[PDB]
Design a binder for this molecule. Structure first.
Ligand SMILES: CNC(=O)c1ccc(NC(=O)c2cccc(-c3cn4ccnc4c(Nc4ccc(OC)c(OC)c4)n3)c2)cc1
Lengths: 5, 274
């Protein structure tokens, strides 16, 4: 939702 | 930088938790006074030990910073787990605060985002890139005093460069990242200015999530089409224009923090006068 890889 | 575990008293309730580990309130015995602290405690069970390397990297960046609008590190401690001991900012994350305090006036939001720009102007002057500037990382001491936190993605710039080049796309806060960060993995202070524009949008939306309902790839696509988030309800037009300026697509034409801070400063002075 916030940190995307 | 190394603290004495005997001088540190921890409470049992966690203020927050996740992949990083947990955060706890505590007290640290100083020379005379006792200091209320926020302690980031490493997961330990999920050692890695990448978590330990980034915690000391975070500690190394924090030790070099000295500004009223930046969270101060008391020190580090190796005991039950590695601990990052910071000066407590009692009211917590700005997005959490504003979601629970919708009565906060626009003048007060301008005052808080102006304080964030002053800390970012200092970070820019220090040649540090934040890389995680978001409302969740702005912490409140009081309703009228904001500090910048979370230096886990921060980098000290090399003496010969204006930006930090990442090699691989990591676990990134994509919705706060400028096009040059997503497209060329290049992080400069102007990249943090882009993130600052998103943070401003969040603050004037009372801690609403930016680009609601969208994936990072749809955001990138939206930004390429020249589309930007709309003006939050009740947000002054002058603040929205400053947001759009922070959102200049081309890094070369985007303002820096000294320009951003000056614009915020003058507008705050205008708002104060009535
Ligand atoms: C909508 N939801 C949220 O946005 C959301 C939720 C939780 C968090 N953050 C965290 O998990 C977190 C992780 C690591 C460290 C800290 C940290 C660090 N510090 C340094 C100095 N002071 C603090 C400090 N204070 C604090 C003071 C009061 C609080 O509760 C009212 C509080 O709750 C998290 C934190 N926290 C925080 C971010 C966003």
């Amino acid at each position: 939702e916030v940190y995307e890889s | 930088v190394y603290l004495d575990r005997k001088l540190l008293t921890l409470e049992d309730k966690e203020l927050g938790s996740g992949n990083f580990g947990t955060v706890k309130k505590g007290y640290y015995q100083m020379k005379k006074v006792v200091k209320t602290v926020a302690v980031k405690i490493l997961k330990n069970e999920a050692n890695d030990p990448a978590l330990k390397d980034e915690l000391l990297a975070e500690a190394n960046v924090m030790q070099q910073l000295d500004n009223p609008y930046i969270v101060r590190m008391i020190g580090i401690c190796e005991a039950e787990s590695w601990m990052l001991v910071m000066e407590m900012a009692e009211l917590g994350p700005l997005n959490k605060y504003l979601q629970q305090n919708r009565h906060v006036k626009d003048k007060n939001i301008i005052e808080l985002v102006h304080q964030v720009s002053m800390g970012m102007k200092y970070l820019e002057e220090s040649n540090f890139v934040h890389r995680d500037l978001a409302a969740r990382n702005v912490l409140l001491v009081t309703q009228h005093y904001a500090k910048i936190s979370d230096f886990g993605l921060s980098k000290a710039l090399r003496a010969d460069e204006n930006y930090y080049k990442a090699q691989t796309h990591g676990k990134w806060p994509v919705k706060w990242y400028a096009p040059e960060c997503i497209n060329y993995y290049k992080f400069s202070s102007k990249s943090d200015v882009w993130s600052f524009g998103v943070l401003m949008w969040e603050a004037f939306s009372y801690g609403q999530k930016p680009y609601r309902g969208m994936k990072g790839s749809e955001v990138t696509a939206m930004l390429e089409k020249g589309e930007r988030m709309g003006c939050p309800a009740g947000c002054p037009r002058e603040m929205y224009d400053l947001m759009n300026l922070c959102w200049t697509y081309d890094v070369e034409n985007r303002p820096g923090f000294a320009a951003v801070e000056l614009r915020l400063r003058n507008y705050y002075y205008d708002v104060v006068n009535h």
